[PDB]
Amino acid sequence: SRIGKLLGFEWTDLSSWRRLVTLLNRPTDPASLAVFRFLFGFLMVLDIPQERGLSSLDRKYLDGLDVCRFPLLDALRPLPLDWMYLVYTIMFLGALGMMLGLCYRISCVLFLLPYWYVFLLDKTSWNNHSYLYGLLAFQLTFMDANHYWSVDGLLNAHRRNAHVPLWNYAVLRGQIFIVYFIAGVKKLDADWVEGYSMEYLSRHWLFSPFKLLLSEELTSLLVVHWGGLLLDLSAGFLLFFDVSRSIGLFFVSYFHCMNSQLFSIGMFSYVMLASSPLFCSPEWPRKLVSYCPRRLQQLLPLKAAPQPSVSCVYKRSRGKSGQKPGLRHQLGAAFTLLYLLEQLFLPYSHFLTQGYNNWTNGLYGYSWDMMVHSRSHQHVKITYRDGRTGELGYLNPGVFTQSRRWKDHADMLKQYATCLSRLLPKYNVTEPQIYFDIWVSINDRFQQRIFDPRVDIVQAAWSPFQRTSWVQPLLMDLSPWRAKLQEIKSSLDNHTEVVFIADFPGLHLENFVSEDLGNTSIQLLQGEVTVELVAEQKNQTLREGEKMQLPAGEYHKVYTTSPSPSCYMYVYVNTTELALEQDLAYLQELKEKVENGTPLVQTFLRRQQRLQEIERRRNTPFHERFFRFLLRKLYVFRRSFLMTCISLRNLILGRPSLEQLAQEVTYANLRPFE
């Protein structure tokens, strides 16, 4: 058997459906599966009050406030606040039951259903690790993970060390390998292989040892980008094979420990750290409990040979001939194959749902593309026209929204426009027509429009499977300007700002320059533009390299007259801020020189107080910050528990008068002890 220890099976095991079913139902030790179940349940229990939003349920789902919401299906609606609290309570009970191993399958369903309901209620909170938590719960619902270290065995002789089928480990290993490979297959973009995605990450103090032998640019390009891509592409292969398992384990442990401190991503790094020993032998916890000293080997459960179980199948040369697979042995193999195929296909299915394709493909959350694209937003304008009188008005951007992801997607923009159209008649506005003007730059590009500003979105056509026509294409043949843009930006002072704009032919930009923005100019970089002064009604054509000075406190318009897109930039300085800073410096220097020999004073003293606080925090040890962190966490947990108790009591018995409820609310918001 040449290949019988590098892969775990032989080529003859895949020569028939029956042989494949026999191979995939091979009995296995369940200890590692049990440890993983315990750890995932604990992590989900800890995660529910923090990231799932139990501590802000009253703020999010108030009784009678006007909110625009973005569900995947518009038919999906939230429940009243008390029923929302009940849903969260059921989810928490399910997570606790999953962790303990008590009533395993009912607990699995009780966690799985409200979690996915909450996920599908709101598209603006989707990310990759929440999607992964849902997928893992779905997998664990169909697994025999309560056969070792549960409470079910310590009450029912059947689930005390029994065997499990082989595909339970196969599905989990395939899932972890998929995410790793998929993540390393989406990092083959030129915006990442060229060092644009995370250019400021290497400035952290955690990259100091690399700077000893490398420069800043070289440590940003060599280590953060290419090193990360290599780790992503090689982690699964390194972990699969046992000759490289220790090296791979050390690398992934360092990677996830670094990521836990670099970002704020909840419990994703710890789930990834805990999912790595699933690649080792299924019996490693037994060896670990055997290696410990004998003085602690008499209180833990005894180590014995695992008992036979009905879930798996037994093929022996002398122990009878064979058992014909039933309806349970073939279903596991079919589920494994189909689930792995679907997990492989879904991150590459964007050619079918074209109505969700903006500058970036698909909705964010299920494609394993983390930290590849970074967005900057310069300006948002919303304008309406009254349908009965005809006046024009302007709205504050994001009035009835609780998030900001509506500026990048056309489906969310359509939902927001419909919500605004339905809610505006409450403010003496007849059937309106709404227009949007949003300026975005992606990965340090030219700022441009994403949507057509001349199209009314209330009547615009949107379909899930049709490409949207009112989305402005990304100007790809302008990216090589980035080096010149960085040169220009670095060639400025400490009180001068610059904005780079790319405009489409046939459109125009209306801009009101603030009164305090003295010394504002515009320089043409490509194409041709015309600048119109509104007060003086005077036009002026510009050619490449031309610079023009603009007045403050007035209106001006820029017209794009080239047959191709044109690029220009704004240079401006806050004259009021400059004068205030210089006179503050004058006054402070004079006072200090006299000593050694009024909003500005307030700002300076508060800045000095901030610096003193920062210095004191730097000088103090980390134990005080640890105590503060623990106090904050305990406050969050206590408030969540008290709110849940109040809501449950209201639901079960009945709401009291408007005094006891206020007293309870005031009591719950009390800090435990300072």
Binding site: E51, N127, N128, H129, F263, S264, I265, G266, Y364, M370, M371, S374, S376, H377, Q378, H379, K381, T383, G393, Y394, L395, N396, V399, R405, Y427, W439, V499, L509, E510, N511, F512, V513, S514, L517, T520, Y555, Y570, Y572
Partner: peptide, 28 residues
């Protein structure tokens, strides 16, 4: 404030906000 005036709705060269980093993967 639900509504804006013409002058304040066209102030393009203003500080946007820059709410920390706040990338799509982070929770914060």
């Amino acid at each position: 404030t639900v509504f804006l005036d013409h002058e304040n709705a066209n102030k393009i060269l203003n500080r946007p906000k820059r709410y920390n980093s706040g990338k799509l993967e982070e929770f914060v």
